[PDB]
Amino acid sequence: GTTGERPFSDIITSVRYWVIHSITIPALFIAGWLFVSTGLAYDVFGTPRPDSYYAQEQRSIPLVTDRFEAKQQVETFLEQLK
Amino acid sequence: SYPIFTVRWVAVHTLAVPTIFFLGAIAAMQFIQR
Amino acid sequence: ANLWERFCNWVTSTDNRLYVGWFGVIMIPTLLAATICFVIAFIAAPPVDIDGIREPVSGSLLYGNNIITGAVVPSSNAIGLHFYPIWEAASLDEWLYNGGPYQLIIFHFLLGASCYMGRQWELSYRLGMRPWICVAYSAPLASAFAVFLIYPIGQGSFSDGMPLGISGTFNFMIVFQAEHNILMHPFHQLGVAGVFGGALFCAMHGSLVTSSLIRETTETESANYGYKFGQEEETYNIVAAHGYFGRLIFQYASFNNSRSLHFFLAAWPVVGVWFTALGISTMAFNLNGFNFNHSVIDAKGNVINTWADIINRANLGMEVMHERNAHNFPLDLA
Amino acid sequence: AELTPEVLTVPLNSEGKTITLTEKQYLEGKRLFQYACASCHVGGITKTNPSLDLRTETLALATPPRDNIEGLVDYMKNPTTYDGEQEIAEVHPSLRSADIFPKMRNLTEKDLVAIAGHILVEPKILGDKWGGGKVYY
Amino acid sequence: GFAWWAGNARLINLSGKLLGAHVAHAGLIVFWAGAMTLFELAHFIPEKPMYEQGLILIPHIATLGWGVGPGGEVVDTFPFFVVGVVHLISSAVLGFGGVYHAIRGPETLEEYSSFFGYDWKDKNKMTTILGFHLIVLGIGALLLVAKAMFFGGLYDTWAPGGGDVRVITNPTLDPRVIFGYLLKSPFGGEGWIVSVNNLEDVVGGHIWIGLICIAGGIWHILTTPFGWARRAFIWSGEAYLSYSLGALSMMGFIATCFVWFNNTVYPSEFYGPTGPEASQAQAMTFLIRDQKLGANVGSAQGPTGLGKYLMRSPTGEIIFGGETMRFWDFRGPWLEPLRGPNGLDLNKIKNDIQPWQERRAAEYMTHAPLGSLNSVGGVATEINSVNFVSPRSWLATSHFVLAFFFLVGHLWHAGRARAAAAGFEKGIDRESEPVLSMPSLD
Amino acid sequence: GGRIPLWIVATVAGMGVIVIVGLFFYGAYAGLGSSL
Amino acid sequence: RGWFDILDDWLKRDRFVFVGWSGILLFPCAYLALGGWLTGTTFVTSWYTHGLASSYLEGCNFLTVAVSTPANSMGHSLLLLWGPEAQGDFTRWCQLGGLWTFIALHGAFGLIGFMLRQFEIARLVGVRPYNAIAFSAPIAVFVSVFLIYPLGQSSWFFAPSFGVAAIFRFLLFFQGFHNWTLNPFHMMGVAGVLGGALLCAIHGATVENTLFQDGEGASTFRAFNPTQAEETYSMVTANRFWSQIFGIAFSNKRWLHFFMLFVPVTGLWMSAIGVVGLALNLRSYDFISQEIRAAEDPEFETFYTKNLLLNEGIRAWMAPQDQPHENFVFPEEVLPRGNAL
Ligand code: CLA
Ligand code: CLA
Ligand code: CLA
Ligand code: CLA
Ligand code: HEC
Ligand SMILES: CC1=C(/C=C/C(C)=C/C=C/C(C)=C/C=C/C=C(C)/C=C/C=C(C)/C=C/C2=C(C)CCCC2(C)C)C(C)(C)CCC1
Ligand SMILES: CC1=C(/C=C/C(C)=C/C=C/C(C)=C/C=C/C=C(C)/C=C/C=C(C)/C=C/C2=C(C)CCCC2(C)C)C(C)(C)CCC1
Ligand SMILES: CC1=C(/C=C/C(C)=C/C=C/C(C)=C/C=C/C=C(C)/C=C/C=C(C)/C=C/C2=C(C)CCCC2(C)C)C(C)(C)CCC1
Ligand code: OEY
Ligand SMILES: [Cl-]
Ligand SMILES: [Cl-]
Ligand SMILES: [Fe+2]
């Protein structure tokens, strides 16, 4: 019924367990938060900010239309915001 | 007489560590305004 | 030795090839009336004016339908929720034009199916069984009630009950999606989970038991002959099966109690179908699926479409096209 | 794009004077439009009379022109038919009929400017969608 | 020997602790009634119709006549506060008695007092407790009568002049009317008891029900079951539970159809229009609009050949056209002024439609009971904007779900009660399997 | 190896999930994706 | 006793999560398919491939987030990170739909990994490999829908996007364009899925209500011992019950459990085949006899003709926003609409 690993119930009721994870768990939560609040997640993944979906007087989707020019096409759209 | 770091240990944190990080990021998102 | 007691003894006899029972006394006639009317109408009924607009829809084989397109067509929108037995029509010709057979069939069937569920309790008691198989069957019965009675009640007309046909069934689903966005409703989502999961677990339990059959046969014979009807020992090795499945995932994610396992098998699809039956029944009162149309806008206020807005475009095309001659005013309120 | 002041600049009267609302007013107007008006005028249409919408071009051809703050503020007080021939306060919410339309009861003069402004700003953001109907959803 | 998950089944033969459970649970119900009203009142805004505000308890109090005047306009919110506070306070008393009897009080009552102790198999004691509660129930229905006839009356949506609170001086006593309702078919244009359409019939039926319940109480206190009743039922706690589960289920389905169709004891002023009502109001709205423009709505042929605004029902009555032909059984105070002996009167339509009727129709058409789970009002293809789901949709769907599950509970507990009483709810005796002692089917 | 009672860990983690889920549900009504 | 056997020893050790040779394939790919989907639905848009928001970061909820398919202009490009389209730029790769192929391909190899795992564990534990065989049905569905179907069309764009509402849109597309409900191969799949659910419920119900009394508690679960030799419920009583209730009943435990494997597995395989046909627009769209009659006889109407009108509505109202690269512009006057609506 057992293969040698320490039982889960034995672990999460232990004091050493909660001494470490009371730090690691919030720290991870805070790190994730900061990835968003600093705006880093936008830049890493290329996701439009609420103000950068369209240019001001634009209602056309900036749709990729070329396979091998696709990279340059997105950068063209992005500069038409900057 | 229980090993701490095991294959099990790796499997678990492989899922747990990003799940909490993601949870924090998704939490922050709730306060974004347009 | 009294005539009435002999009759009671035969009705409840456990020796009849098919159990009759007191619920059977109502189920046998109502199911025969429904079945006989259904067969005849499916083959030879004339076109029915389902939507009350004098636009009769042809449902039967002899009027140019095949097995896939044929249906017994719901009764006229002019009738609404009014009772329309045969003796309320000036003639059978009138009764046929207005969709009278649909009411006869669905009422006799819902009764007979209701007594079908009670008959399952009844025999379980005569045989000294536990009583709850009928509770499992209440999930399909609730589903039939929803599409044939409950949804008609909420919308005010049997003309919006589910047609008794294959293409009619699809007509019903498409319109229900345009009108209630059922796909975005959590009780239908639970129903898909009950029905996918039930198919999954059916397959799993079938392959695990089949995988751990104890060798009792040669390769020239069907392994099925390694089981004899009524043998006392189990025909498969539940610990080998548990030992395989507990390693495929991990140990505690596998049953080794057969009673918990089979209860899980009963519970999962029964409950998911309860919900999907309840989904139809509550959308009958127009508490619809989640509406996320235009939920995302940008810093100026442009709508930023999501997949839900695409769904809505599809829904709109079903909406503007269904019952194309039947609406005089801009809102389809029922 | 964003809610720039050009977007928030709408005509005040027929004479041609303009007015620049704040983002606060715009959001206030949208909130009040939803409270007092959306049930009939969601998206800039009119569910109970689809022949009349809230497109700026439709308002402009109304008698009293209604494509300006004054025209709208006056309409919310003493509404008339499209040609100005008859007053319709008895079948349309207004301050004059707040006894029969109780939601107009607690609307202040600044509330009306906001509601009006939202109606004039929104076709600048959504274009054809405003007053277009399901075709543009 | 029940598992923790069937743990309340341990209370079956502990009449003391089982009393605590029941009384504490009664506390929860009274508490919710208290808390919810206060929550609704704190959120109430009188300038908005109730049905634009997610209210389900304030309308129940308004209907009893409290807090409202002509046309259903709220004139005094203090009666709402009182009902919630008193309910809230009372829940502590029930809570108190409930956790006392469940924790500290005697575990079983029959040793303490032969009056309050009971054996489930005591058919006489059981019918006496039934009788007590029957009398209480009968008193309950007479309180509604008392309020109606001696304490301000009730809200009358059909009152002349837009609806008003009205004291009821001539409740209907004629049993041909009162029990006539029990014998109308439940189908369209009949509607069984859901069709009750005036407060005289409502008050009168409660006189009857009140008397019949008081009559049945004493009956069941003075009698014990006859042998035909004794041979026909299972006499056990779980059986009695299953009987009431069936009754609660049946009652839940009726309540569902009641709040969905009936606009009398669920006034549309408070609850919003019904489905039929709202659909009728749309046809009315565009009849009024098109005829103001010059359309002769009586002679207008629609695309199908049927009249665009007006057609006949299958028995001949002039009714609204379009898909709302299905709803011609609808009757409402804003509509009936237009009906003559043949249905809708074309001369009344051309001449006698009032602005208040136009207002009402536009209002009900735009408040039809259609809306999304996240409370986006209107058809499923509507864009976000209107935050609205009719109280009638909320009240109909919730109680259909509850009614369905209690029918499943009836089946569950009825079959188990039968199996337990016969002695095989735990499985089949290997040494004595019935089928093994039966002849084979073939 | 057993100091913290299990039901304590269960209750607290339970309320931790409820908190985060309710934050996500609050967020459906505010900010992005609120329709407003 | 060289390095290969020392590795074999380690991979096949009885541990909390069995690894095995198949683990080398399964776990990396299963984890990265999963990780890609959670990453993309949290952080990645579909603005440039679809014109859709599709992440929590953008304001979407669990029902509307998706990892969407690449733009139609990518054709069937593998969209490798290092490939000619994204050219090693991770940001651009995300914006061009690279996570879709990343998930679909790593998912394909994970499903292989998982099925090899079922073979591997079955071999070591000594059981017959029927659970692996049954898993052929999920795999056939996955490859026919996610890979074979878009490969027959113009691009990956028309594969399903990995998300809840995006799959819903997939269902409705197949109704309006392929008339997929009319396909007999789908109908067989429906019968297999609903037949499986039925078999699942009816079998579990029957076992639980034909139990032997093997203990005294009112909880019947306790009274089963996983090593007992005896059947825990009566097959003889169950056969009688169903023979009398339904006319026929199972009498062979082995057949019954094989049938439960057979029914849903076959159903899924059948639906995979029809999707292969839809890869080629080889639909069962029409009945020719119906249309000939309908074209000549304006009073002829069936539920078949009514449903196509719906299909035509779906196509005209959803195509412009659903296929944006086609620049469909349908003026109001050309849209098919019934009266008033
Ligand atoms: C008046 C109503 C009533 C009463 C008094 C009983 C009483 C009883 N029932 Mg029955 N039951 C009822 C209605 C009722 N039931 C209904 C309507 C159904 C169908 C759904 C059932 C189905 C049922 C089954 C299947 C079984 C019982 C059993 C029992 C016994 C033990 C129950 C127990 O310990 O529960 C313990 C309580 C729980 C385990 C908690 C349940 C949690 C529910 C399911 C979730 C509810 C959450 C809610 C929907 C939303 C939550 C929101 C979130 C924030 C949390 C007891 C005698 C057992 C029995 O037969 O004993 C003899 C048994 O096996 N009941
Ligand atoms: C309305 C819900 C309800 C009610 C009233 C009861 C009531 C009861 N249950 Mg049941 N039960 C319920 C739901 C309910 N249960 C559910 C959902 C489950 C599944 C989780 C169970 C599972 C269950 C089991 C497994 C058992 C019971 C038992 C009991 C009885 C004794 C409990 C005891 O001694 O605990 C003692 C507990 C405490 C002392 C802890 C504190 C509890 C108090 C009362 C909290 C009160 C809080 C409140 C704010 C106080 C305000 C006071 C103020 C008004 C003055 C009691 C009559 C037992 C029984 O039958 O005994 C023979 C038993 O074995 N129940
Ligand atoms: C129907 C519910 C119910 C039932 C059957 C019982 C039954 C019993 N209780 Mg319990 N009890 C209840 C509710 C109930 N109680 C409540 C609600 C409370 C909190 C107030 C208590 C608090 C309580 C205590 C503290 C004790 C008992 C005791 C007893 C026993 C003897 C009581 C006696 O001699 O009567 C005495 C009777 C009276 C004084 C007459 C009271 C008549 C009332 C006031 C009229 C009816 C009230 C009405 C319905 C609601 C008020 C109106 C409101 C709506 C505005 C008996 C087994 C005793 C026991 O067993 O201890 C060993 C004991 O010590 N009970
Ligand atoms: C909650 C209320 C309640 C409950 C649970 C009981 C329970 C009981 N009563 Mg009592 N009874 C009550 C209220 C109640 N009664 C009231 C208020 C009165 C006064 C009129 C009576 C008058 C009364 C008498 C005169 C007798 C009983 C008897 C009995 C016992 C046998 C009942 C029986 O065979 O039913 C089974 C019912 C039938 C076999 C006949 C069913 C016929 C119905 C009306 C058909 C309805 C069909 C349809 C589906 C329902 C829709 C409504 C329809 C009428 C339109 C049982 C213990 C009997 C007994 O043994 O007394 C000691 C007896 O002789 N009761
Ligand atoms: C239904 C009960 C309505 C509500 C609530 C609101 N409006 Fe309305 N509006 C309605 C109708 C039936 C009409 C046409 C009446 C006629 O015969 O002309 C209107 C018209 C308007 C207009 C004029 C539109 C035009 O093109 O000229 C405006 C500017 C207008 N309505 C504004 C408005 C506002 C600001 C509201 C909230 C206070 C509002 N309406 C509510 C129906 C209904
Ligand atoms: C037995 C049991 C149980 C149960 C319990 C119960 C159910 C209870 C009840 C109880 C209750 C049921 C309670 C109640 C309470 C109440 C109270 C406590 C009250 C108070 C109130 C107040 C104090 C108020 C105040 C006020 C006023 C006066 C005015 C207005 C404002 C306010 C609101 C503030 C359980 C399951 C858990 C467990 C097991 C056992
Ligand atoms: C208030 C009111 C009113 C009145 C009412 C009344 C008058 C009622 C009555 C009612 C009643 C008077 C009812 C009754 C019922 C009954 C029932 C519901 C029955 C049941 C039955 C059963 C359940 C049985 C069963 C069985 C059988 C069949 C066989 C044998 C076995 C047994 C016994 C099980 C009106 C409407 C006017 C109006 C409004 C208000
Ligand atoms: C892509 C990519 C990658 C990878 C990545 C990954 C691997 C990721 C992962 C990630 C992850 C791994 C994530 C996670 C997440 C999680 C979450 C976000 C969760 C959530 C959940 C929740 C929300 C839940 C809740 C609940 C409910 C609702 C109910 C019941 C209870 C519970 C609590 C369960 C790499 C680097 C290779 C590179 C390339 C790209
Ligand atoms: O969905 Mn659309 O809504 Ca219910 O009615 Mn009005 O139209 Mn017609 O009769 Mn069948 O269908
Ligand atoms: Cl149609
Ligand atoms: Cl219409
Ligand atoms: Fe099995």
Short mmCIF file of C-alpha atoms in Angstrom, two decimals, chain A residues 35-53, chain B residues 29 32-33, chain F residues 32, chain G residues 43-44 55-59 91 95:
data_model
loop_
_atom_site.label_atom_id
_atom_site.label_comp_id
_atom_site.label_asym_id
_atom_site.label_seq_id
_atom_site.Cartn_x
_atom_site.Cartn_y
_atom_site.Cartn_z
CA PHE A 35 4.46 40.03 -13.36
CA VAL A 36 1.08 41.64 -14.10
CA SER A 37 1.24 44.87 -12.07
CA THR A 38 4.58 45.88 -13.62
CA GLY A 39 3.13 45.38 -17.11
CA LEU A 40 5.84 42.80 -17.85
CA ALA A 41 3.29 40.16 -18.92
CA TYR A 42 2.10 42.45 -21.71
CA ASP A 43 5.55 42.90 -23.20
CA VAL A 44 6.66 39.27 -22.84
CA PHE A 45 3.64 37.80 -24.59
CA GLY A 46 2.73 40.61 -27.00
CA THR A 47 -0.77 41.13 -25.59
CA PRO A 48 -2.42 44.49 -26.45
CA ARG A 49 -2.95 46.90 -23.60
CA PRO A 50 -6.52 48.27 -23.40
CA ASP A 51 -5.39 51.38 -25.28
CA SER A 52 -3.42 49.57 -28.02
CA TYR A 53 -6.01 47.44 -29.84
CA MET B 29 -5.77 41.15 -13.24
CA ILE B 32 -7.03 46.33 -14.10
CA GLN B 33 -9.21 49.15 -15.44
CA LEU F 32 -12.01 44.34 -17.77
CA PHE G 43 -1.67 35.82 -21.14
CA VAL G 44 -1.96 35.51 -24.94
CA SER G 55 -6.98 35.66 -22.24
CA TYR G 56 -7.67 36.48 -18.60
CA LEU G 57 -5.18 39.33 -19.02
CA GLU G 58 -7.46 40.82 -21.69
CA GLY G 59 -10.70 40.54 -19.67
CA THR G 91 6.73 37.35 -28.64
CA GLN G 95 1.03 36.61 -31.60
#
